């Protein structure tokens, strides 16, 4: 069958630059091509057929080209709206195959997360578990880490992160990150910490809390 | 006035047999294609198979083992039946017009429907648990959505009269069971002059819970 490599596989860039997305074919596709545009929670839609034809609707700011086994998309003058995953596909022959997706982001200025940490509830321990929740909200760019410590002492295991798209207003990210532990476990230890590092400080975001406290 | 709509039990446990329904309007499917795309995490788009205006079929080369797309034309119906599903199988499966050469876009797919979300687990239906996240001139709270499945949940804050400064992240897996957190930022005023409650909708247990977030 015909791999579709698509790349690269993430780009962020500033409302008005030129976006240049490639798709290479493991094979000549000889311009049997589309590229789809899949907004977020919404459904795939196709922006450009047969290599460079444009799709109804679709703003002259896009234009596709390529042929053989080399094609590549372009968008002109990014606006918000283009936020989006973006796929090839081509359809030379069967099977049909997808190039992995290109998912573009809006760049913005630097934004340092304004960090929460919470205990967990009283109700929560009764069932014998309890989760330690931090939160890093509307920061820029995406990258980010975060370290919990128990009594200045890191904890690797039994941490869940889950972060937040884009937002479509501010463009900043959020992400929680929660340490679930046994009650034993946390009513053995008193210092609770969470560290977060990101591009905005050259130390650490530190929040902590005392069990006993 | 082209329209695809995908319909089918959007929940399967595992090794079991996943049936959905793609039924059209607006073309007939004598002489157009119908191809069935799916989308999980951290995949992208797959294409499965189709079947085309004669009733051909064309399947993806690792799913066609177990996959097997139909039609009724009389109904305007495409079919999709894939066995022995496992968990990577959890994604949103959409299906997909392609006009071939009676169309000016050929064998690009034009058109889409919204698409239907299919969970494949062993897991049973569980309403969450609702615990407070309380500090312990604006203060950050939250609450906990925990132990429910299958998604989703949908989180207010006072009814909806907060929702500015609201954020409720994507559910985590373990067990089974989803967690999920939502926070919400307020004036210190409101915080200590106004009672603030979560309000947490589980549509598939046919539950509604509100927790109050009270200061510690
Ligand atoms: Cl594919």
């Known amino acids: 069958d015909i791999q579709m490599t698509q790349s690269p596989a993430s780009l962020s860039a500033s409302l008005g630059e030129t976006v240049t997305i490639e798709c290479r074919a493991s094979?000549?596709?000889?311009?049997?091509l589309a590229w789809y545009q899949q907004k977020p929670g919404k459904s795939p839609q196709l922006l450009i057929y047969?290599?460079?034809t444009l799709h109804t609707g679709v703003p002259s700011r896009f234009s596709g080209s390529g042929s053989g086994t080399q094609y590549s998309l372009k968008i002109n003058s990014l606006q918000s709206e283009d936020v989006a995953s973006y796929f090839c596909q081509h359809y030379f022959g069967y099977p049909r195959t997808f190039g992995g997706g290109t998912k573009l982001e809006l760049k913005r200025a630097d934004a340092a997360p304004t960090v929460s940490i919470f205990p967990p509830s009283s109700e929560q321990l009764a069932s014998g578990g309890a989760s330690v929740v931090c939160l890093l909200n509307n920061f820029y760019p995406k990258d980010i880490s975060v370290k919990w410590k128990i009594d200045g002492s890191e904890r690797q295991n039994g941490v869940l992160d889950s972060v937040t798209d884009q937002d479509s207003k501010d463009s900043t990210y959020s992400m929680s990150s929660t340490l679930t532990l046994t009650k034993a476990e946390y009513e053995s230890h008193n210092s609770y910490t969470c560290e977060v590092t990101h591009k905005t400080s050259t130390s650490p975001v530190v929040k902590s809390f005392n069990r006993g406290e | 006035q082209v329209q695809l709509k995908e319909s089918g039990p959007g929940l399967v446990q595992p090794s079991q047999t996943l049936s959905l329904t793609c039924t059209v309007s607006?073309?007939?499917?004598?002489?157009?294609?119908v191809n069935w795309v799916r989308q999980a995490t951290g995949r992208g788009l797959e294409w499965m198979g189709g079947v085309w205006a004669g009733g051909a079929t064309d399947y993806n080369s690792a799913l066609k083992s177990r996959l097997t797309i139909t039609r009724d034309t009389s109904k305007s119906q495409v079919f999709l039946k894939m066995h022995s599903l496992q968990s990577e199988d959890t994604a949103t499966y959409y299906c997909?017009?392609?006009?071939?050469?009676?169309?000016?876009?050929?064998?690009?797919?034009?058109?889409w429907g919204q698409g239907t979300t299919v969970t494949v687990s062993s897991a049973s239906t569980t309403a969450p648990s609702v615990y407070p996240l309380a500090p312990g001139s604006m203060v950050t709270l939250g609450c906990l959505v925990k132990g429910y499945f299958p998604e989703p949940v949908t989180v207010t804050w006072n009814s909806g009269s907060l929702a500015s400064g609201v954020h409720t992240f994507p559910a985590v897996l373990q067990s089974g069971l989803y967690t999920l957190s939502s926070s919400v930022t307020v004036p210190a005023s409101p915080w200590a002059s106004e009672a603030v409650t979560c309000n947490v909708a589980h549509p598939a247990s046919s539950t509604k819970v509100d927790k109050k977030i009270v200061p510690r």
């Open positions: 997909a017009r392609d006009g071939g050469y009676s169309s000016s876009t050929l064998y690009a797919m034009d058109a």
């Open positions: 607006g073309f007939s499917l004598t002489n157009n294609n």
């Open positions: 094979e000549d596709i000889y311009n049997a």
């Open positions: 047969n290599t460079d």
